[PDB]
Design a protein around this ligand. Structure first.
Ligand code: HEM
Length: 153
């Protein structure tokens, strides 16, 4: 479980992400798609996008970025009491979208890269540590629902 202090480090930097949800969402998805191109192939909506410049220009991608970060934010702010929010997400991602747990690890790494670029002063090693723990908790709870439903390990 995270401590109350580790949750404070997480939510202090998240309040900053919330000053520019759309800009953050874009940087994260682009980083994901460039670092792990197989992830782009899950999105019928985006797989036409070939270059970073085309990605940066897509308003539809920006929109999805806001969807992703807004769902994540609502989970983080529950501080691990996140059952009601996480269950519908794991169900759709397991059964409808077919998203391997490994890809959740990839987008975790993208989130932490981007936070580090935009918010150095609020994202030191102790914050990076807390954020890593929070994302692991997110993954571990998703993985439990995946196993229940019979989805890939
Ligand atoms: C922090 C991780 C993520 C969060 C919070 C998240 C959240 C969401 C939300 C809220 C939606 C819309 C409602 C629904 O379908 O459940 C969605 C849709 C989707 N997500 Fe995720 N997602 C995450 C990770 C991923 C990753 C890693 C991928 C793919 C590699 C993925 C692929 C998709 C696809 C294919 C859709 C449908 C988009 C569309 O075609 O409209 N998601 N996600």
């Amino acid at each position: 479980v995270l401590s109350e202090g580790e949750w404070q480090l997480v939510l202090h930097v998240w309040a900053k992400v919330e000053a520019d949800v759309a800009g953050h969402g874009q940087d994260i998805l682009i980083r994901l798609f460039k670092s792990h191109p197989e992830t782009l192939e899950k999105f019928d909506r985006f797989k036409h996008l070939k270059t970073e410049a085309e990605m940066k220009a897509s308003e539809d991608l920006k929109k999805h970025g806001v969807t992703v970060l807004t769902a994540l934010g609502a989970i983080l702010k529950k501080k691990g009491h996140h059952e009601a929010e996480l269950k519908p997400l794991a169900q759709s991602h397991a059964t409808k979208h077919k998203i391997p747990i490994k890809y959740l690890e990839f987008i975790s790494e993208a989130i932490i890269h981007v936070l580090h670029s935009r918010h150095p002063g609020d994202f030191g090693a102790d914050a990076q540590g807390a954020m890593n723990k929070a994302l692991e908790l997110f993954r571990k709870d998703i993985a439990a629902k995946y196993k229940e439903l019979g989805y890939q390990g």
